[PDB]
Amino acid sequence: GSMNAPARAAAKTAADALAAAKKTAADAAAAAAAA
């Protein structure tokens, strides 16, 4: 059980919200290259 199944679904919402900010973090790099 390398990946935790219960935790995956539970913390999913937290990861979802953080993916919003992580998007901009990656975007700052990507948009600085592909411009």
Curated annotation (Swiss-Prot):
For this UniProt record, the keywords arranged alphabetically read as follows: Antifreeze protein, Repeat
The family assignment reads: Belongs to the type-I AFP family.
What is the recorded function of this protein according to its Swiss-Prot or TrEMBL entry?
Antifreeze proteins lower the blood freezing point.
Q: Provide the protein name.
A: Ice-structuring protein SS-3
The source organism is: Myoxocephalus scorpius (Shorthorn sculpin)
